[PDB]
Design a protein around this ligand. Structure first.
Ligand SMILES: O=C(NN1C(=O)[C@@H]2[C@@H]3C=C[C@@H]([C@H]4C[C@@H]34)[C@@H]2C1=O)c1ccc(C(F)(F)F)cc1
Length: 367
């Protein structure tokens, strides 16, 4: 028999200067458990890589340095745009194998956002706490940890597809025949979850034929929302700016409005503050302002460094990820998202969203 929730528990970062309190596992505690219980390997992936920026980040890096010195294979995948701190990292840990990744060499837009850990094919973390000293200590984050081996192995297979896009000689990032020979597999998806948990992936050109696109899964859950939509992402402005041009993409932005106007879903949105100089953010703000007064919508903003990417639907489905609901992310970027329908796991997620919705850092949207 399989366990309910796949042995999953919540993990997050609550800085001391912030009023967030919870009994769940902390991000700093989580990484020590992974490194201490590690016996075979430790695979880590994120965009930036800068652990020494805080005290708690430097302690995990020292525990990982000790791990690489005892015979544990340590491989760290970072996007080639976080290559500044590379010489600093290898200078402190020579035994850790750092690898620069460029998943999109066709247009150089897709970035590596896959923010997760995996060790011994038994334990694993996933969330929005990137391998930075801030995301462990000073930046509020949110993730999930599970010591269920079958779940960690299906997350290891996500790591295998990403490692192939290394910038060294002929590989999946250089050759097209070596990129087509990738066993891009997945053990569980929306049509066959494990213990009520499954993974969704991104972008579309890295799914193969078995994996699920996170874009289609999120929109389907938003269009199938009957009661409540609770989102805590950085921003949901349908327009992003790639290079010196703007990219309009309102797929997630419209499916939410379709819920609050046609279906009358009580929707609460907790996004970060925006720039007054950005006409795209201001026009998006003045639009949402007219809906909280007309339909059952509510919007609050925050100014703190927060990477949280949470989506709760009808107290029946929870979606934690590292990418933000926008066009640039769900079209080119590569990451892995957490999906679970376990009522007890979604309940603990609703417990967190309510906490942040009433926190002092969440002031009401004023225009
Ligand atoms: O979302 C609406 N408009 N809107 C966009 O289409 C975006 C584009 C244009 C302006 C900004 C950004 C540059 C991108 C965004 C924005 O606010 C909107 C939704 C519902 C209503 C109604 F109130 F009738 F319910 C009216 C309008």
């Amino acid at each position: 028999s399989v366990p309910a929730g796949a042995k999953c528990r919540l993990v997050e970062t609550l800085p001391e200067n912030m009023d967030f309190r919870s009994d769940h596992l902390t991000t700093f505690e989580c990484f020590n458990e992974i490194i201490t219980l590690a016996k075979k390997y430790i695979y880590i992936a994120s965009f930036c890589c800068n652990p020494l920026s805080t005290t708690r980040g430097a302690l995990i890096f020292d525990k990982l340095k000790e791990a690489s010195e005892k015979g544990i294979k340590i491989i760290v995948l970072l996007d080639e745009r976080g290559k500044r701190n590379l010489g600093e990292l290898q200078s402190h840990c020579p035994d850790i194998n750092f690898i620069t990744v460029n998943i999109d060499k066709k247009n150089n837009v897709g970035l590596l956002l896959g923010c997760f850990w995996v060790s011994d094919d038994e334990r694993c973390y996933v969330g929005n706490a990137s391998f930075t000293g801030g995301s462990i200590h000073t930046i509020k984050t949110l993730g999930v940890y599970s010591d269920y081996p079958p779940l960690a192995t299906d997350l290891r297979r996500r790591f295998d597809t990403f490692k192939a896009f290394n910038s060294a000689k002929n590989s999946a990032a250089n050759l097209a025949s070596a990129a087509a020979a990738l066993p891009v597999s997945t053990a569980y998806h929306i049509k066959n979850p494990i213990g009520g948990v499954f993974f969704t992936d991104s972008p579309e050109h890295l799914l193969g034929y078995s994996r699920d696109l996170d874009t289609d899964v999120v929109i389907d859950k938003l269009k199938s929302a009957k009661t409540s939509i609770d989102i805590e992402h950085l921003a949901i402005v349908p327009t992003t700016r790639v290079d010196g041009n703007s990219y309009y993409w309102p797929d997630i932005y419209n499916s939410i409005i379709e819920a609050a106007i046609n279906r009358g879903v009580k929707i609460r949105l907790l996004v970060g503050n925006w720039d007054k100089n950005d006409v795209y953010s201001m026009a998006t703000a003045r639009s949402l302002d007219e809906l909280c007064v007309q339909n059952d919508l509510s919007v609050k903003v925050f100014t703190i460094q927060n990477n949280t990417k949470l989506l709760i639907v009808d107290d029946e489905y929870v979606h934690i990820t590292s990418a933000n609901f926008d066009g640039t992310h769900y079209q080119n970027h590569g990451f892995v998202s957490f999906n679970s329908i376990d009522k007890q796991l979604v309940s603990e997620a609703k417990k967190i969203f309510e906490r942040d919705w009433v926190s002092s850092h969440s002031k009401s949207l004023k225009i």
